[PDB]
Each structure stands twice: as C-alpha cells, then as structure tokens.
Design an enzyme around this catalytic site. Structure first.
Site, mmCIF file in Angstrom:
data_model
loop_
_atom_site.group_PDB
_atom_site.id
_atom_site.type_symbol
_atom_site.label_atom_id
_atom_site.label_comp_id
_atom_site.label_asym_id
_atom_site.label_seq_id
_atom_site.Cartn_x
_atom_site.Cartn_y
_atom_site.Cartn_z
ATOM 1 N N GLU A 1 0.752 -1.516 0.187
ATOM 2 C CA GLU A 1 0.247 0.376 -0.061
ATOM 3 C C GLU A 1 0.555 1.577 0.050
ATOM 4 O O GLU A 1 -0.151 2.662 -0.201
ATOM 5 C CB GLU A 1 -0.908 -0.235 1.217
ATOM 6 C CG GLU A 1 -1.891 -1.153 1.028
ATOM 7 C CD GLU A 1 -3.429 -1.049 1.863
ATOM 8 O OE1 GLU A 1 -2.943 -0.060 2.548
ATOM 9 O OE2 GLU A 1 -4.047 -1.867 2.188
ATOM 10 N N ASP B 1 -6.834 8.337 -2.531
ATOM 11 C CA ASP B 1 -6.458 6.896 -2.648
ATOM 12 C C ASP B 1 -7.244 6.401 -4.235
ATOM 13 O O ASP B 1 -7.654 7.062 -4.540
ATOM 14 C CB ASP B 1 -6.915 6.345 -1.820
ATOM 15 C CG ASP B 1 -8.240 6.018 -1.159
ATOM 16 O OD1 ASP B 1 -8.996 6.310 -2.523
ATOM 17 O OD2 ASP B 1 -8.921 6.120 -0.409
#
Ligand SMILES: [Ca+2]
Ligand SMILES: [Ca+2]
Ligand SMILES: [Ca+2]
Ligand SMILES: [Ca+2]
Ligand SMILES: [Ca+2]
Ligand SMILES: [Cl-]
Ligand SMILES: [Cl-]
Length: 348
Positions: free
Chosen positions: A43, A52
């Site tokens: 991530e 995101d």
C-alpha cells in the site's frame, strides 16, 4: 529501615515486571516490523495526504482519513489522530504509530467477526499477516465473503486455498498483490516480499521480610483491593519514567498472573520476586535499583533525589523523614548515600 527496603523492593519489582516480558516484546516488535514491511510494499508509505483509488483522502500506510471530499476535513482528522498541527504532513514514526493502531483495529475487527475469528486463530503468525493484509485492502466484510477459501485455510489445505484464492475478482483487480498475499498463505513464509526490500527485512521467608514485601506491594496496589491491575502497574511505571503501552502493561501482568484471573495478588507478587532472573546477578539488581535513586548518576543519592523517588513511588513522607532516611544510611557522614552505603542498607 522499612522505608528504604519497601522502596527498594518496589523499584526492583518494576524492573522485574519489565525484564520478565522482554523476550515476548522483542518477538512482538519483530512481528510488527514484518507486517509493517509487508503492507508498506503493498500500500506504500506516504508522508503527505493523498487520494486513494476510490478518491478518498488517506496518509501513511493506507490510513483512511475521511470519506468527505474535503481536504479540510482530512487535515482535521489527521491532526486529531496524530496530536499536532501537521498541515497534511507526517513523519515516518508517526505513520508507524498510525499503522500499529490500524493493525490492532484490524485484529479486533477480525476477532469480532464470526466468519473470520476461527480462521485467524488457527493461522500461524506469518499467515495471520496475510489475512490482515486482505482486511486492509477490502474490509472484514469483503474478506468474510471468501467462504470456501477461509475453510481451506482453517483446515491447512494450503495449495487448494491458493488455487481458489486466485479465482476471485480480488485477484483479477490486483493480481500482483494477490499473488504475494497468496504465496504468503500457501508457504507460511515471507518469500514473496523478501527480495523486494533488498532482503534487509523479515529476519521460606521471615515475618519482617514478608511485611516489607507487603508494603512494597501496596505501592502498586494503591486502592488496597489486594490486587495489581494493568492500570495500577502503568501508574507506577510512568511515575518512574517509563512509558509502556497498554499492550506491554498487559503482557507484564499476564506473565506474572499465574491463576489467570487478570490481576496480580500478593502471592503472585512474592513468586515474582523469588524467581531466578536470566543473566542478572543479585548485585545486578542492587546496582540497577541504585541507578534509579541516583538520578543524575554521580554515584551519590542526595536528599532531593531520594525525595523524588519517594514521591514518584507514592511513599508519602515528610521532607524531614526523607532527611532521616539519608542520615540512617549515611556511614561516612557526607550527608549523601553512595553505592556501598546503599548495599549495606539493603543487606540487613
Ligand atoms: Ca472463496
Ligand atoms: Ca489494586
Ligand atoms: Ca492473578
Ligand atoms: Ca546523585
Ligand atoms: Ca555517605
Ligand atoms: Cl498455520
Ligand atoms: Cl473443499
């Protein structure tokens, strides 16, 4: 006489609470570092607020700040999580603390979920990281939908679970990460992450003595209910300049809590004080305790240094009673207590 010894025992007991759990804490730190490197690969670790894939403001290692499409809202959640005015920027260590908090929350959510808790409990430490990784990606509910693969994981059918996991939309949408996660489930090793990261990661006693131990115990058991709680232990550790986390305090309690009832009674405290300690001499414990009293390390306990220890421990004494303790221990008459004078006071 009792006043010196009660303080000495309490100080030594604090040191033993720490020492007895120190090997478990090394293990846990290494496990946390492993899952930190795992999820950082998968991530990223971003020090600045970013959007995101779903367009939401996040920071650190996928830490979601808000689903509002408001940067101001994101900055305010960040400032609250971190405890300072970050203006949208954090440090590595702040991201690590955020990450540790999200891991603890992921585990708590896993164990509240009836579909996930049995699988998780049955998994070994590396494979638990794989399951937590999936929860970071898609949430407890998403992972709990993997009903057939979870059963195979619970039953240790590693190769079949891996085949089945690869037939999901998860794998189709993010196959590089899913491959790594699946290898982790299948092998129970860090092989899918090692080479990334250049391979730096993933590697019988008298009546008076009893009375003194009771007195020392009462400095921990401040409410007098006959037990030491995690919260009472934390209060003492902090007043002595430690800052253990709740989890560390819970591990110190658990390691001494022989009857498993959640708190430490006087018998368990005595047992702890009688234990053979690993590599530490008896002189090692006097020396260790002396350094707590001799705050500035000049080799002499002053009246004001003793004053502090007594206050920190909650041994309530007048300034005159503290002066009296120095004089009692003072052999050469310079009005301070040196190491050998300390030894003499404790061995009698
Ligand atoms: Ca499935
Ligand atoms: Ca208590
Ligand atoms: Ca107990
Ligand atoms: Ca000193
Ligand atoms: Ca002296
Ligand atoms: Cl396992
Ligand atoms: Cl089956």
């Amino acid at each position: 006489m009792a006043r010196w010894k009660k303080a000495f025992i309490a100080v030594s007991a604090a040191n033993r609470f720490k020492k007895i759990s120190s090997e478990e804490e090394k293990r846990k730190r290494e496990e946390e570092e492993n899952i930190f490197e795992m999820l950082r690969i998968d991530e990223g670790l971003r020090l600045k607020i970013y959007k995101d894939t779903e367009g939401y403001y996040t920071i650190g290692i996928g830490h979601l700040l808000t689903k509002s499409p408001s940067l101001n809202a994101a900055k305010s959640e960040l400032d609250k999580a971190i405890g300072r005015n970050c203006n949208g920027v954090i440090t590595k260590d702040e991201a690590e603390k955020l990450f540790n908090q999200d891991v603890d929350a992921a585990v708590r959510g896993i164990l509240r979920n009836a579909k996930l808790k049995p699988v998780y409990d049955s998994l070994d430490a590396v494979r638990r990281c794989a399951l937590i990784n999936m929860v970071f990606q898609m949430g407890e509910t998403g992972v709990a939908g993997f009903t057939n693969s979870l059963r195979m994981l619970q039953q240790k059918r590693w190769d079949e679970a891996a085949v089945n996991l690869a037939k999901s939309r998860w794998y189709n949408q993010t196959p590089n990460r899913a491959k790594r996660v699946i290898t982790t489930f299948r092998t129970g090793t860090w092989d899918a992450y090692k080479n990334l990261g250049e391979n730096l990661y993933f590697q019988q006693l008298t009546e008076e003595q009893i009375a003194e131990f009771k007195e020392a115990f009462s400095l921990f058991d401040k409410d007098g209910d006959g037990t030491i709680t995690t919260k009472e232990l934390g209060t003492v550790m902090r007043s002595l300049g430690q800052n253990p986390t709740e989890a560390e305090l819970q591990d110190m309690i658990n390691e001494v809590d022989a009857d498993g009832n959640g708190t430490i009674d006087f018998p368990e405290f005595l047992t702890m004080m009688a234990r053979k300690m690993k590599d530490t001499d008896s002189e090692e414990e006097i020396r260790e305790a002396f350094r707590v009293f001799d705050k500035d390390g000049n080799g002499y306990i002053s009246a004001a240094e003793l004053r502090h220890v007594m206050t920190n421990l909650g041994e309530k004494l007048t300034d005159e009673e503290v002066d009296e303790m120095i004089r009692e221990a003072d052999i050469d008459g310079d009005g301070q207590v040196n190491y050998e004078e300390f030894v003499q006071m404790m061995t009698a």
